[PDB]
Amino acid sequence: KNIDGYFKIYSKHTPINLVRDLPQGFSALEPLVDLPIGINITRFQTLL
Amino acid sequence: FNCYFPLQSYGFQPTNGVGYQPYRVVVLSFELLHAPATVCGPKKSTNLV
Amino acid sequence: VQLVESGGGLMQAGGSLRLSCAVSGRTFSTAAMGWFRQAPGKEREFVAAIRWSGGSAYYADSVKGRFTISRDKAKNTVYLQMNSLKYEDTAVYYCARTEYVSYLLSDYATWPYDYWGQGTQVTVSS
Where are glycans found on this sequence (chain A)? Predict the structure, then answer.
């Protein structure tokens, strides 16, 4: 989430055993990064 | 007509009235983020009790 | 800062000439460039102006539909394409430059410019 020019990045890693879709349950994502970019963002993309 | 350039120059001559003379302006804004505080004052630190 | 004019000279009526004016030396900014002309015994007279940003042009009535002013920012050069030449176009043509930014383009017709070229003769023959 980019708020007031600051790009906050939270994340969480967890082991899973499922090939269908998101496992049902609950887990919280902890903040890892806050970049003071001030860059305008309206779109994004993934790289594999 | 009804189509103007949005900007205009200042007329800064040394003989201009103080009201029209150039003034340099600096604005300091302070910020606490969801990140470590890295800007600090000169106040000397002390041992912990 | 120097304004170096070139082109022009002699051309028969109905023909076309192009004037160039190159800006040399360190500039902070350019607001507009202009062409003026002075015929013998007559007052120097506005011909055309161009805003450096955006390239909008303003013309004296006497040259509308005949002359085109244009700019090459990368070459720091202004041009006057002088088409459908008439005897009345015979004059010394002067390049001018200003850093004064007016919101109002028509101001460049009457604004006193800061920098002037040496002048280039245009002579229109029969």
Answer: 40
